[PDB]
């Protein structure tokens, strides 16, 4: 059916994990400065993203199929999984915001 | 294992998106009346559903695999995605009810 | 990329349904005692799990792909589907805890 639709500048929406992960990635290496040698690396492979941060070791952060959707493996706080509530990425365990979690674990490695 | 189960009138539960989309579809063309020419068409293809409504143009509404589940493309309010909270379909962005959203956008096209 | 990761005792996280279903399963046959003949069987096939409980008949409990994730077929309360909120398995219909639901339906069959 309708031609009223496909004559528009259509596009494909984009995964919301994908999105977070960019404003993460760039928000991140763009702190790979204020890294006084101590956050050496951000790497965003292919919906897999790594922090070297020898202070605690290395974080991995994946996209993942549901039962629920972004996966956190923090070498300090350990493992967690996230889905959207009100447009925030939040913890399936107890509903903390992953932003916050990194935001801490990350500020602790400058601070220290 | 058990024969105590498959001797019952068994069935397969049905997608909850599927359900909404019917009591939507029929709730909808059944307003394709009170359409004073101005909501011309509802079309429910194959888990894809279209509103022609030339007042703003044409809405699409899909079933979608998670990262989250019913997709709204409103030619007026733009794009949104929905999952169940308390048995309501609600917005992943901010948790509004999609019922409400259509309910407005739709009443605006008679009103106008 | 990094070797700082795969030299750790890595593992694969485990489905959260899977988990519930074990501390369920064992929590369950381990009540297949206090079963005064009246909860005869728990069977955990392959992410499919059955209660014979002739008092109401037989419960099935599945893992299921999302639109949402653990499926309850109670021969008494009928059918329900569950996902995590704050690390609890909760009802998509109205957000009751499935623990509670079984916890009742199950205590009713001793009680009676």
Swiss-Prot record, chains A, B, C:
Impact reported for residue 33 to A: Impairs resistance to iron-catalyzed oxidative stress, no effect on Fe(2+) delivery and cell growth
Mutagenesis or variant effect for residue 43 to A: Impairs resistance to iron-catalyzed oxidative stress, no effect on Fe(2+) delivery and cell growth
Effect of residue 71 to A: Impairs cell growth, lowers aconitase activity and strongly decreases interaction with ISU1
Mutation effect (residue 37 to A): Impairs resistance to iron-catalyzed oxidative stress, no effect on Fe(2+) delivery and cell growth
Top-level lineage group: Eukaryota
Effect of residue 33 to A: Impairs oligomerization and iron mineralization
Listed name of the protein: Frataxin homolog, mitochondrial
Provenance organism: Saccharomyces cerevisiae (strain ATCC 204508 / S288c) (Baker's yeast)
Lineage: Eukaryota, Fungi, Dikarya, Ascomycota, Saccharomycotina
Gene name of the record: YFH1
Span covered, complete protein: 61 to 172 of 174
